[PDB]
Design a binder for this molecule. Sequence first.
Ligand SMILES: NC(=O)c1ccc[n+]([C@@H]2O[C@H](COP(=O)([O-])OP(=O)(O)OC[C@H]3O[C@@H](n4cnc5c(N)ncnc54)[C@H](O)[C@@H]3O)[C@@H](O)[C@H]2O)c1
Ligand SMILES: NC(=O)c1ccc[n+]([C@@H]2O[C@H](COP(=O)([O-])OP(=O)(O)OC[C@H]3O[C@@H](n4cnc5c(N)ncnc54)[C@H](O)[C@@H]3O)[C@@H](O)[C@H]2O)c1
Ligand SMILES: NC(=O)c1ccc[n+]([C@@H]2O[C@H](COP(=O)([O-])OP(=O)(O)OC[C@H]3O[C@@H](n4cnc5c(N)ncnc54)[C@H](O)[C@@H]3O)[C@@H](O)[C@H]2O)c1
Ligand SMILES: NC(=O)c1ccc[n+]([C@@H]2O[C@H](COP(=O)([O-])OP(=O)(O)OC[C@H]3O[C@@H](n4cnc5c(N)ncnc54)[C@H](O)[C@@H]3O)[C@@H](O)[C@H]2O)c1
Lengths: 366, 366, 366, 366
Amino acid sequence: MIIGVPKEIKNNENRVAITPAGVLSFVQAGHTVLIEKEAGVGSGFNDSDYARAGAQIIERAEDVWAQADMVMKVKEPLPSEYRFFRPGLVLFTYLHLAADPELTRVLKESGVIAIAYETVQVGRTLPLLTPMSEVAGRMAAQIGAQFLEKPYGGKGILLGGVPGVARGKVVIIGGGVVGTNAAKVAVGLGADVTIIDLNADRLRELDDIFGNQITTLMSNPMNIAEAVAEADLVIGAVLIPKLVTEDMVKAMKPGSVIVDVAIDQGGIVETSDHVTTHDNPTYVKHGVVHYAVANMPGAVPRTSTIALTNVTIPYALQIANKGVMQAITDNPALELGVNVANGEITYEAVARDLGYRYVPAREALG
Amino acid sequence: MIIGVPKEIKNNENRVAITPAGVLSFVQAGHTVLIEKEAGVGSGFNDSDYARAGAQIIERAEDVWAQADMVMKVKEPLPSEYRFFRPGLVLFTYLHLAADPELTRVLKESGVIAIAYETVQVGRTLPLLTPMSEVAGRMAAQIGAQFLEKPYGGKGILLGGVPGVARGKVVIIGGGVVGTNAAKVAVGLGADVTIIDLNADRLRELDDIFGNQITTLMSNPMNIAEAVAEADLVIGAVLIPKLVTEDMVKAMKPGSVIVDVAIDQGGIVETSDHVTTHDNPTYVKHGVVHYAVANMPGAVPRTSTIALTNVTIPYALQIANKGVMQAITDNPALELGVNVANGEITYEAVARDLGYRYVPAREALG
Amino acid sequence: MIIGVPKEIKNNENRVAITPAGVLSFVQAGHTVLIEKEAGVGSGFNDSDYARAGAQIIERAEDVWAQADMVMKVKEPLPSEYRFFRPGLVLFTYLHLAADPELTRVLKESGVIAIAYETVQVGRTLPLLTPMSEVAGRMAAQIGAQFLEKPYGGKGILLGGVPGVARGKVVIIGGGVVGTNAAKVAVGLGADVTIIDLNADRLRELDDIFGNQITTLMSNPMNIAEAVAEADLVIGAVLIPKLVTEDMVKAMKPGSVIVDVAIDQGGIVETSDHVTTHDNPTYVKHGVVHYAVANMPGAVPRTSTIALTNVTIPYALQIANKGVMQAITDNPALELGVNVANGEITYEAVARDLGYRYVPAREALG
Amino acid sequence: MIIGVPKEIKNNENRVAITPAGVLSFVQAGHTVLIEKEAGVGSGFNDSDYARAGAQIIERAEDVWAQADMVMKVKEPLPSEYRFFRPGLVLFTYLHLAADPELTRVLKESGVIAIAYETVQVGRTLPLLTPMSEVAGRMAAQIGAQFLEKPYGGKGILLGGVPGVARGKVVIIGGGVVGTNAAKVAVGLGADVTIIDLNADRLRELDDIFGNQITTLMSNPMNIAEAVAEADLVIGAVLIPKLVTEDMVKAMKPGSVIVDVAIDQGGIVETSDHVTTHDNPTYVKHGVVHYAVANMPGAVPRTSTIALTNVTIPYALQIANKGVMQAITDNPALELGVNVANGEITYEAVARDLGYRYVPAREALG
Ligand SMILES: NC(=O)c1ccc[n+]([C@@H]2O[C@H](COP(=O)([O-])OP(=O)(O)OC[C@H]3O[C@@H](n4cnc5c(N)ncnc54)[C@H](O)[C@@H]3O)[C@@H](O)[C@H]2O)c1
Ligand SMILES: NC(=O)c1ccc[n+]([C@@H]2O[C@H](COP(=O)([O-])OP(=O)(O)OC[C@H]3O[C@@H](n4cnc5c(N)ncnc54)[C@H](O)[C@@H]3O)[C@@H](O)[C@H]2O)c1
Ligand SMILES: NC(=O)c1ccc[n+]([C@@H]2O[C@H](COP(=O)([O-])OP(=O)(O)OC[C@H]3O[C@@H](n4cnc5c(N)ncnc54)[C@H](O)[C@@H]3O)[C@@H](O)[C@H]2O)c1
Ligand SMILES: NC(=O)c1ccc[n+]([C@@H]2O[C@H](COP(=O)([O-])OP(=O)(O)OC[C@H]3O[C@@H](n4cnc5c(N)ncnc54)[C@H](O)[C@@H]3O)[C@@H](O)[C@H]2O)c1
């Protein structure tokens, strides 16, 4: 198979859907990899690095997509890329089709086999989304610390204090992948950290991981109100009626900070109702700084690329070795990735949400 | 030399001034040790244990004191023991002579060489008092936890909480030997622990020992007021105008507990103005339980005996090998131990406080 | 729905089946909550706290039970409360019906829908019993430390020793919820801690949680005999022929302590054959102190109330929102809670043990 | 005595030379404190907070300086404040007189008793500079992490990586107060941290503090070259020929970051030859981002104020209680603070460096 990785073109997107490590996995298993010029550079991988791993460097986006059996990306194709679609092309990337009626329609009618990173799933987890959740949680505590600096609108404290000075209070809401990764960094900055979760077994697991390094708190509206009022930094760690209400935010001390990782989806914090750009990253409501930039992992493209590609490529490699049909037969997790194939919407919830007829991927590809 | 160790006779005193380990140190260096029957039993050392180490077991208190060159004890001789004094007798024990005008007078006029554990001193520390300070601090957090149990008058919490439940707040005032030993146990019980100290370098040392396991807080009246109000347990760790005022105690939550280790000396907590017995161990003022039992180390006599004897006997052994005069010549720390010799008060502060003429121990023994 | 929470009336029962946090969960979801006067006070929640959360404060027990659709408690109704039963009343509390033939008969014939906290079950665990197991294990190490104090009959040591003095040996038998919670506190007190378990995978899990902070030991009679003989404190952490025999206890050092958490059920320690009250808390057999007070969590009512209510109320809230029938249809864990409904014994093992006809709760409620 | 604390007027200076805690120390000891409006607000202390502690709030800078015996500040008086000087006025603040020939001349000829925080000294340490060193080191690792984000010019990594991804390399040069505080935060962010120091005993002390959490490396030019080349982040932790050479920086990987805490004094990094403002915070040389903003502690004014005032006020309080002459007689550390009194330069190194006659402070004040 021939695999192609164009440079990401969305604004300030510095990640890339393969690394030299990925190229070498494909080349060792008999395959050919094409990389557009400067694809890796935002993630500090140069054309020479990809070439040394055994890839061909391709001048023009167009020739990568045209010469490849499968294109891998990080983001969704933009309209400027619809031109490169073709029947039987495999596209492997983050798609978010349920919220992109238009992209779905063009993929469907262009004959694309479109595989979504975010719907590959083993049990209750999505293994190709986990890496960005992890990165996101690590980032949240770091960004929280930055916006607690007076120059960025914060009340001007260190989470760790210094000897003889009290520590900052970090309240994390949600103790899964995002929250657990945030708690590691917030404990490392020297904060008093409290992790709030609905699920008492998850709190027991966190008590076995963290011990005395944190406080675990059952999630209910009084526990959240009381915790958030005392908090220097609140981290909304629940990606999925709002858990932190305007009245709760109103009770917070001026110059406190709120980082809500689900800001793109509305958030769990009522006051965090809108997103913002890198150049205008916060707004203040009731004296409280709200960090509104989405795609935190986007701020550490090199970590985010390696974490993503560490888990995407072993899936991509099944497709290269076996072709899509055998790969999704052999691997039910990959099967749930196929959103579009051969004229049909092949993922139930996308079909339902947008009004097409669910057609199973295996059936669709016959 | 012949060394004698009577059984302690003060009420419920279970410690003892030597262990088999001590006996064996003396016997190996040429000496004879006498132990009264049941001397060690409150500390779980039996006559057979002392005998196996090479000691003689003596039926009657009187014969131990009469046959011995030096008697070692833990407490001060009671009036019931003045009868056993004699000129040239060495007594090595805890004396507290500055606060016992009467005992001092009888020791002076009986011709006793009286050596106080608590005035042996190297630099700024008293090495034969350190062990009871350590034991005391370890005990304070344990006793604090007990009196936070509802049956003992406390509000009924675990310092550690359980998963999903907040931890208790322990505020320790004083970050030296007592406080540092208390913080180890309070952190181990799972409390949020704050250590308050005047000395910013000591707070830096505690931050290097404990890291993120505690909060260090500079000592001033607002820091103490604010910390004590939030505290489930306050531990007064300063042995030396009161640091915790009635108004501060009044702001505390009902069922909170105060353990003040200097209760014998007045305390640093205004409300803790009196001491109490094991059978009536607390009183409540403003809803706050005050643990009033003195001699905490007395509750763990076996640990307290071993910790004491580990450091008293190497000093006692210099006296056995060299006689008092050479021992105090060779060892200035031991010299400062001699409070009474040969008619004179040989420790300045005792002479001053009680109105006798300071006479140096070396001069006094000539 | 109207929910009522009387004050617990068993002797010295200071817990309570709801907190302001619970009240607010019910009020936000459309419900009415009634609280009898002084219900929360043993757990340090006042009528004003419940009122501020949106509850009505009710003068007389009788009016709470009469005006409520569902009564929540901690303990079983006493005979003095049979008067308040009525057909169609929901009672949610700890029942222990298999061991209370009489209570079961009155609940059956009074027409009560009786739901037992202790038989709600997900897989192999009982989620509404877990919190008291956790509290119990945390308490066991603390009580162990207390009874090792000479005034309480112990040999007079600190588990942690002090510098230059050996640590105490804690042997915990059973490495599940109770034992794991005890090991956290015993390690925190500075003990040498050994955890004995039958299940080598649980020992591997404990080695990953605790590392070098403990010794894991396979459970067999020689490992237990040898461990218990060396132990200052033994904690029986197995709730379910006796694992510690009289001969094993006989080999222990005088002034050692045994806390057996299953004392109510006979225990795993042969010598611990009877229970005792707070005022007479131990007996000595073969020189070994046996702590015989049951209901350890009862000594920290405030922690125990919050830990219980953190998990009981989300179940109670399904009943309030959906009524018993829909709640147990939708939630098999809650279903296994229903012990008595509408004339029938609706929990197999209660029916079998007491000689009634098992009738499924859904069938029974038709 | 009357103490006055004006609002700091240097650009973006948000610290303040007293807190309510400080006010209360002064008021309890008989003194009067004046605070200008909005003095504390950059540090989140409001006029109401100072008033509640017992201070008078003063409308105009001028009236604070005129009515006060002693003015306390954080920064040096600006020219705009020379007007408020007067003979016999005590000024207590950070002065840096050796590098301010002009300020020194005006203080001398205005008759000011000028006491420098930064020359109070006990042994080899300056206790009123320690707090900003601590804050500075804590900040350096946090700022380092920020500038490793791609949007701030960095190569785009997390220091901690995520599971399956390598950690970032932090190299700290200097293992004293600044470096040790940086290492705590860099270890907490999950970096591989190496601390370089000349002094092998300091490396032994760091190995006892940190254990396996760091690598200690002896300082020599090859160790530094090799460490810096492998480093994602270098922190210059030496306040005092350059330790990191342009050739060493040239060998670093593009998008690496250098935070040199002595940037104000020239730095230990050759490439870091100039300082920059908050709005233009870095420059790139040889692909390496150089953070050039000075006064890091200035970014966390509230922590910095509390850490400073925790140690300045106990010195200020000796002056209030005893007057300058007795205070500096009784306290040699404070004595070395007096830089200017009563016409003379009273600190040797200032006199020498600027060409005046050293006159001892006690002599000068006669
Ligand atoms: N698309 C999704 O959001 C989704 C759904 C299921 C699982 N996942 C998996 O988890 C990752 C996403 O990270 P995540 O940390 O947000 O999810 P997660 O499942 O790892 O954790 C979410 C946590 O939030 C807790 N929670 C839910 N409601 C809460 C409330 N009201 N109050 C407090 N806590 C509450 C849950 O108990 C859980 O522990 C993905 O990488 C995937 O592996 C994703
Ligand atoms: N007899 C004494 O009380 C005495 C005096 C000097 C040293 N020591 C040594 O210390 C042991 C006694 O233990 P200790 O822990 O009480 O003494 P310690 O000297 O070890 O510690 C006392 C601590 O209290 C702090 N402190 C003092 N005033 C304070 C205040 N107002 N607010 C907050 N902190 C304050 C000090 O800075 C110090 O760190 C003895 O074993 C001996 O070695 C004894
Ligand atoms: N009613 C019960 O006793 C019961 C039964 C099943 C599970 N549970 C769950 O566990 C909690 C009760 O706590 P727990 O810690 O007693 O139970 P647990 O299941 O958490 O742990 C008991 C432990 O004892 C060990 N064990 C059993 N026999 C042993 C032996 N002979 N020697 C040594 N170890 C032995 C088991 O391997 C297990 O690890 C409840 O909260 C519930 O969640 C309860
Ligand atoms: N004004 C000063 O710079 C100064 C001088 C002496 C002490 N101090 C004290 O220290 C604080 C200042 O912080 P700091 O951390 O910079 O000083 P510090 O004295 O705490 O530490 C500096 C460290 O740098 C190390 N070092 C020196 N030359 C080195 C080299 N070539 N390579 C590697 N390591 C080297 C030293 O061994 C020392 O451990 C002040 O708060 C004060 O307490 C200040």
